[PDB]
Structures are given as structure tokens and as C-alpha cells.
Write an enzyme that holds these catalytic residues in place. Structure first.
Site, PDB file in Angstrom:
ATOM      1  N   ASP A   3      -6.458   8.741  -0.563  1.00 63.31           N
ATOM      2  CA  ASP A   3      -6.017   7.657   0.334  1.00 63.31           C
ATOM      3  C   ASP A   3      -4.857   8.098   1.253  1.00 63.31           C
ATOM      4  OD1 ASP A   3      -7.743   6.245  -1.375  1.00 63.31           O
ATOM      5  OD2 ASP A   3      -6.049   5.153  -2.279  1.00 63.31           O
ATOM      6  N   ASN A  50      -7.519  10.602  -5.460  1.00 58.01           N
ATOM      7  CA  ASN A  50      -8.310   9.787  -6.374  1.00 58.01           C
ATOM      8  C   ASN A  50      -9.179  10.614  -7.320  1.00 58.01           C
ATOM      9  OD1 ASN A  50      -7.412   7.279  -5.059  1.00 58.01           O
ATOM     10  ND2 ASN A  50      -8.869   7.815  -3.439  1.00 58.01           N
ATOM     11  N   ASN A 110      -9.046   5.427   2.703  1.00 61.09           N
ATOM     12  CA  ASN A 110      -9.819   6.329   1.860  1.00 61.09           C
ATOM     13  C   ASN A 110     -10.724   7.385   2.601  1.00 61.09           C
ATOM     14  OD1 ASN A 110     -12.536   6.435  -0.133  1.00 61.09           O
ATOM     15  ND2 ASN A 110     -10.569   6.444  -1.174  1.00 61.09           N
ATOM     16  N   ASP A 137     -12.333  10.295  -7.808  1.00 63.88           N
ATOM     17  CA  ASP A 137     -13.684  10.532  -7.316  1.00 63.88           C
ATOM     18  C   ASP A 137     -13.765  11.738  -6.372  1.00 63.88           C
ATOM     19  OD1 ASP A 137     -12.556   9.313  -5.062  1.00 63.88           O
ATOM     20  OD2 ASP A 137     -14.289   7.985  -4.693  1.00 63.88           O
ATOM     21  N   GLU A 178       0.827  -1.186   0.000  1.00 62.65           N
ATOM     22  CA  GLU A 178       0.000   0.000   0.000  1.00 62.65           C
ATOM     23  C   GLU A 178       0.877   1.257   0.000  1.00 62.65           C
ATOM     24  OE1 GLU A 178      -3.137   0.176  -0.661  1.00 62.65           O
ATOM     25  OE2 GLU A 178      -3.159  -2.037  -0.947  1.00 62.65           O
TER      26      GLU A 178
END
EC number: 3.2.1.17
Lengths: 127, 169
Positions: free
Chosen positions: A52, A46, A59, A48, A35
Site C-alpha cells: 500500500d 502486504n 494498493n 499477498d 490511513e
């Protein structure tokens, strides 16, 4: 803070992730490697609108609040910045919230692909 | 004119977390974001969204829906985000998502998707054909929509595993 593998393993054992919902310690260490490479300040924007945060790339749509993701739910009830701290406590508790059942680590695709099925306790040995 | 149970900032209408049993009436036709998540909506009326053609984000997650009306998203040509997760849906009707040409994110997980039944095939094939579209609780995950019981990905289901015999009615 970028953790060493051992140093990370010890901190996660201290915060009770060893065998959390059946998942032994190396699993959590292995997931963090893919990660964030053990970097607590790791950050990814991100498409959207969410971002993160931290060693496990948690998130801001679902889990933490950063003040810049609309319609976010803050299911873990921490500021996203608490997830960038050199102290992993908040990241662990939020990882505990995400992992609801004995299959909950499927959430981390890179874990599911690169970690699950292997001898994960290797990530814990030598320490 | 913003609905009584809902807060409204510009073109965003927020009916989340308001113990609602149905979709408020009177949502303005110029709404672009519509939060309906975390309620107790159990059904949607055919055509409830039909006049809401400017929607880009629609959150329907964490309600109690069992079924969707056919055509329910057909007018939503600008819709980029759709959350459906944490409901009680067993299938998605043939063609639900076909008019959704601006879609970039859909959330489907934590539904008791019934993969024993023929009705699941539209969805399983849709996800197979749209591997950039399905997100779980972190990032992209076309395996996050899962079969109840088995917990295997819906995307993987073929006709050979299904029967019409196992669909409702």
C-alpha cells in the site's frame, strides 16, 4: 512530505475532491489521517505480495504498478512511486478512480468506522 | 505444453485480458498461478480444475459467471488466493470452500449476491466463520461481499431474512 491538516485540506479542495460523488471535503482529509497520518511516503507491505502506497494507502494489486506485484492490474495507470510524491495529484486521481459511486469510500474501513457518521467538516474548519 | 491463447513463465499461466469465452484447454498439471481474469468466461465445466492440484493462486475475477459448478474447487488443497469479484454470482454452492485449507485471501465483492434467498446462507455463514479471509480492493474487509439492492454485508444474513421461495428454478 507529512502534510498539516489545513495544508492537506487546501490541496484536496484544489484537486476537486470537495463533494466528489457526494462526499464533502472533510471526509477525504479524515480518511488520509487514519490511513497514513498525512504522510505521502507512507508504505505498507502486504502478505499477498502487494504493497500500500501514500496518504490513502492505495494498493499495488489493483490500482498502481510497483514492478514487484505479479498479476497486478494497474487500474489507475500510475507507478506506485507517483503515489509517494510530495504532490498529492496522483493520489487524488487514484482515489477518484476507486470511488466509483456515492458509496465508494466504504473502501476505507478505517474511514467507515472512524469518520463516516461524525461531523467530518471539523477536519476542514479552522483553516 | 502451454495453451495457445496463453503466455507461460515457469509455473505461471496467464490468460488474462484475452477476450476468452471459455477456460483454455491444456493447462499443465504443475501450474501454480492461473490468471483468467478480465475475460468473457460465462461458465466453468465441472472438474475444470480437478487435475490442477498445485495451484496456489487462481484469479477468476472480472468475467461473467452466473453460477459455479459444485465441487469446482475441491481438489485445490494448496490454494492460498482466490479472486471471484466482479462476476454475476448470486450464491456459492453448499461447501464450495470447504477443502480450501491453505486459503488466506478471497475476493468476493462486486457480485449481485442475493440475500433474499436461502442459497446465500452457506456463504454468509462461511464469511462469519472466516473473518481473516475476505478482502476488498484495499485490505481485509469482511463487509466487502454485499447484498444486491440493500448493499449490506452478506455475512450478516440469517435464515429469518431468507426464503427458499426466492431461489432460482
Amino acid at each position: 512530505k507529512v502534510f498539516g491538516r489545513c495544508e492537506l485540506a487546501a490541496a484536496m479542495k484544489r484537486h476537486g475532491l470537495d463533494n466528489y460523488r457526494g462526499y464533502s471535503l472533510g471526509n477525504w482529509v479524515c480518511a488520509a489521517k487514519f490511513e497514513s497520518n498525512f504522510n505521502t511516503q507512507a508504505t505498507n507491505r502486504n502478505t499477498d505480495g502487494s504493497t500500500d502506497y501514500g496518504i490513502l494507502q492505495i494498493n499495488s494489486r489493483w490500482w498502481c504498478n510497483d514492478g514487484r506485484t505479479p498479476g497486478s492490474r494497474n487500474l489507475c495507470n500510475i507507478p506506485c512511486s507517483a503515489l509517494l510524491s510530495s504532490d498529492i495529484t496522483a493520489s487524488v486521481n487514484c482515489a477518484k478512480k476507486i470511488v466509483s459511486d456515492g458509496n465508494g469510500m466504504n473502501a476505507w474501513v478505517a474511514w467507515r468506522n472512524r469518520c463516516k457518521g461524525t461531523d467530518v467538516q471539523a477536519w476542514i474548519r479552522g483553516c | 505444453a502451454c495453451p495457445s491463447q496463453c503466455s507461460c513463465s515457469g509455473t505461471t499461466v496467464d490468460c488474462s485480458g484475452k477476450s476468452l469465452a471459455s477456460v483454455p484447454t491444456g493447462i499443465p498439471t504443475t501450474t501454480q498461478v492461473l490468471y483468467l481474469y478480465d475475460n468473457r468466461i460465462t461458465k466453468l465445466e465441472p472438474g475444470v480444475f480437478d487435475r490442477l492440484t498445485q495451484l496456489t493462486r487462481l484469479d477468476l475475477d472480472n468475467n461473467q459467471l452466473t453460477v459455479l459448478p459444485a465441487g469446482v474447487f475441491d481438489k485445490l488443497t494448496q490454494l492460498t488466493q482466490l479472486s471471484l469479484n466482479d462476476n454475476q454470482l448470486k450464491s456459492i454452492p453448499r461447501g464450495a470452500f470447504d477443502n480450501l485449507r491453505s486459503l488466506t485471501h478471497i475476493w468476493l465483492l462486486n457480485n449481485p449476491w442475493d440475500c433474499a434467498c436461502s442459497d446465500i446462507l452457506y456463504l454468509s455463514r462461511w464469511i462469519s466463520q472466516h473473518p481473516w479471509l475476505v478482502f476488498g480492493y484495499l485490505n481485509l474487509d469482511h463487509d466487502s461481499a454485499r447484498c444486491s439492492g440493500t448493499n449490506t454485508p452478506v455475512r450478516a444474513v440469517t435464515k429469518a431474512s431468507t426464503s427458499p421461495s426466492k431461489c432460482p428454478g
